[PDB]
Amino acid sequence: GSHSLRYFYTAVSRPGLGEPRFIAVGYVDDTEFVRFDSDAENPRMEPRARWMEREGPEYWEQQTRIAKEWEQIYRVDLRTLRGYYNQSEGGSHTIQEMYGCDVGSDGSLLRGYRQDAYDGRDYIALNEDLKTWTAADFAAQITRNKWERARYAERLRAYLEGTCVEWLSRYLELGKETLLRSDPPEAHVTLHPRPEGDVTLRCWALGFYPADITLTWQLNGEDLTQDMELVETRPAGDGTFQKWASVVVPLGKEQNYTCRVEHEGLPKPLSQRWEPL
C-alpha cells in the first residue's frame, strides 16, 4: 500500500585530474531501473531492469540530457561549496542528493523530499511541507537564501506532486511482474556453541523479496529484541535478500526458543526452531 520513486546523484572531485565523476541512479522501491555514470564510454542514461528497454529513444535522449544537465550543475556546486568552506584544491570532496516521492496505493502522494549531504554530512533539505528548507550550517544557509529568492521550492513541489507521481505509476505497470511479485523466505536455525558454555542460536531468512522482513527470536511465546544480534540485510546476488538474527541461549533450553519470520510472501508467519537431527 506504498511505493516510491527516488533519484540519487553523487559527484566526487578528482584533484589535479580534471572533472568530477558524476553518477545518477534511479529506484522504484529498492530496484535500480536507470543509471548514469560519467566514467562511462559514452555517458548515457541506461536501463537497469528488463522492463525499461521499452521506453522509447525519446525517453533515453531526454533523460540523458537532464542527467548531463545535472552533471554540470554538480561540477559547479563542488566549486561553490569549496568556496563556502574555504577549502583548497588538493582535497577530494563529495556531494550527494536524494529526491523522490512516496505514493500510497490509492495514488496519493504520502511524502515528497529532496535532501543533500556534502562530504557525507547533511547540508540542505526540503521540508515535508514542500515549501521551506532545513539548512545544517552557514554554507547551506547561503544556498537556502538563494533558493528562497528564486522560489525554487515551488518547482520541486510541482514536480513531486505531479511528474514524480505519474512516472512512479508508469514504472509500476511496466514492471509489475518483478516489482509487485512476492518472493517468500526460506527459514532455518543453526547452533554455534560458545566457549562460555552456552550456545548461539542463529535464524536465517533466505531468498526473500522485497527486503522488508521481521525476524523475532521469542521465548515461551514472548518477544526478545533488546538483546538480539542482527546483520544488515544483504543481497544474495540473484535479486533476493537474506538476513540472520541470533540470541545467546543456555544449553538445554535450545528447544524453548522460536524464530518468527514475517514477510509479505508468507500467508502466515514462520515459526522456526533448532533441529539437531
Binding site: 533519484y7 533523460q63 545535472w70 561553490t80 543533500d116 538563494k146 518547482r155 520541486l156 511528474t163
Partner: peptide, 9 residues
C-alpha cells in the same frame, strides 16, 4: 523521469 528545473547551490 527526473526533475529538470534545477538550480545551483
Amino acid at each position: 523521469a527526473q526533475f529538470s528545473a534545477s538550480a545551483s547551490r
